[PDB]
């Protein structure tokens with residue numbers, strides 16, 4: 001059960017769903033278009049021998065912000081982390097999906113959102129996994145529409161929503177593209 | 190709320206959901222398998238210095254149609270745009286997802302559908318974002334099953350469905366893999 | 379309509395949804411975290427000239443199992459098939475999605491799940507399509523959390539669920555990352 005434009009608007013006007021800033025001209029038949037922030041993480045480390053999800057490696061990426069008025073250039077075959085300009089606050093009874101946009105995929109710009117869902121209870125900017133699969137670099141402009149948020153009704157309110165100690169959540173409140181915290185509570189056999 | 194095979198069939202027999210041509214043998218437990226068209230766009234431009242989503246660049250891709258009876262060869266590490274053989278027409282109260290198929294991913298053929306959803310009100314062929322992540326070229330045969338359409342019920346009918354001036358839709362009615370129109374209404378900060 | 383943690387737990391305690399082994403500490407606001415098996419398929423064939431989805435090519439991949447206590451190393455720009463440690467059994471009235479996890483995408487580990495949905499009626503381990511889009515190899519540990527299962531309610535029970543002869547299903551009961559069976563019932567124009 002995916003929220004139509006009208007119901008998305010109702011969740012926003014009722015204050016159940018926070019989107020800051022909210023621009024109503026971005027609402028779409030079945031989603032709301034979202035915008036790109038000015039914060040990027042590039043994989044440009046030159047000391048580590050490998051990535052180990054069980055280990056903390058905060059230096060794996062560098063935080064990069066382009067000069068005001070300039071794009072970040074995503075190179076062919078490159079993957080970076082970006083972030084939404086908007087801060088989202090979800091209630092305990094909706095879950096979102098942060099998808100890409102067809103216009104952007106037609107240019108070879110892919111938003112992966114590998115994890116699929118934004119969890120009930122989540123509040124923060126959303127970290128975007130961005131790939132360029134074209135043969136040419138792509139100028140990414142801070143502020144451009146980069147994807148769309150779709151909301152699904154939960155069957156019932158989540159018992160221990162994102163942010164709760166019991167969920168063990170890692171990214172509640174994030175203001176940028178937080179480096180991975182997979183090493184926390186990491187398990188292996 | 191995802192439509193079962195029976196309910197998909199009901200939406201089709203009632204005329205609420207158009208799929209042209211419709212082959213009932215393609216309906217699946219929870220989706221309908223879809224087929225590949227004979228139209229492909231390759232990234233083979235040799236004049237542009239880069240991609241700028243704010244700019245119109247219709248020559249970024251070339252339209253390629255294989256000789257009747259022959260496959261299009263998707264090379265390792267290559268991304269192209271393809272298209273569904275079927276033309277889909279959605280009502281204002283369903284949204285679809287055009288996913289890949291597990292058999293094809295097991296060979297390294299990935300349908301990205303980065304944008305996720307086919308919008309309430311959308312009518313046209315669906316443009317497929319296709320990658321080969323194997324070590325070998327893959328022969329793509331026009332007419333083969335290439336993915337599957339899953340339908341979700343909307344919470345309520347969409348107020349301004351895809352195709353409406355208010356939605357500002359770019360691809361209503363597309364018969365092939367339309368080049369990107371991201372430059373239209375493009376915004377940036 | 380996506381199942382909350384509580385409703386996921388109800389489907390499990392009622393015996394409608396099988397997850398073997400089930401670890402309740404893995405349930406999340408809107409999904410259940412899943413774990414990686416010790417079975418991997420690498421694309422390391424050196425005889426075939428190309429991939430043809432219409433043809434049987436069982437030797438396209440090699441099955442690889444790391445030494446107990448050691449990781450499988452996924453190299454930059456590499457795609458392999460992995461598998462869930464858990465065996466899932468779905469009823470005829472739910473469909474699942476096997477997504478990645480944000481912690482893992484922040485390291486450049488992408489679970490594609492190109493096909494999106496686990497079908498009503500499906501029973502088996504789930505085959506994971508894994509890419510490394512970082513600049514560094516990633517040690518994948520058997521037993522680590524690798525993704526999350528989200529469940530959606532179907533509109534109604536599926537008439538011919540996965541596994542039925544009428545659905546023509548290829549992978550019912552799979553215990554590992556089964557090589558592709560796209561050649562079965564393969565169609566082309």
Ligand SMILES: Cc1cn([C@H]2C[C@H](O)[C@@H](COP(=O)(O)OP(=O)(O)OP(=O)(O)O)O2)c(=O)[nH]c1=O
Pocket residue numbers: 100101102103104287302303304305306307308309311314315316317318351356357358359360
């Ligand atoms: C997901 C997807 C959608 N589509 C179609 C169906 C969607 O309803 C339509 C628009 O998808 P959108 O993701 O909304 O594309 P867009 O926002 O960049 O462009 P627009 O202004 O037109 O909204 O494109 C494809 O052709 N291929 C795809 O992979």
Ligand SMILES: Cc1cn([C@H]2C[C@H](O)[C@@H](COP(=O)(O)OP(=O)(O)OP(=O)(O)O)O2)c(=O)[nH]c1=O
Pocket residue numbers: 289290291292293476491492493494495496497498500503504505506507540545546547548549
């Ligand atoms: C999405 C996905 C599904 N599966 C399982 C669960 C699905 O119900 C089952 C079939 O997925 P499908 O995408 O329907 O695969 P298929 O159409 O190519 O093959 P089939 O004829 O059997 O339908 O495979 C995986 O193992 N890995 C995955 O990533």
Ligand SMILES: Cc1cn([C@H]2C[C@H](O)[C@@H](COP(=O)(O)OP(=O)(O)OP(=O)(O)O)O2)c(=O)[nH]c1=O
Pocket residue numbers: 098113114115116117118119120122125126127128129162167168169170171478479480481482
């Ligand atoms: C899908 C996605 C989620 N998120 C946010 C919203 C999710 O509710 C939150 C967690 O996503 P998860 O996929 O649940 O991440 P995780 O399991 O690795 O970490 P955690 O222990 O915190 O659950 O991250 C992004 O920032 N970017 C994304 O692409």
Ligand SMILES: [Mg+2]
Pocket residue numbers: 028101
């Ligand atoms: Mg749109």
Ligand SMILES: [Mg+2]
Pocket residue numbers: 217290
């Ligand atoms: Mg199938």
Ligand SMILES: [Mg+2]
Pocket residue numbers: 406479
């Ligand atoms: Mg999580």
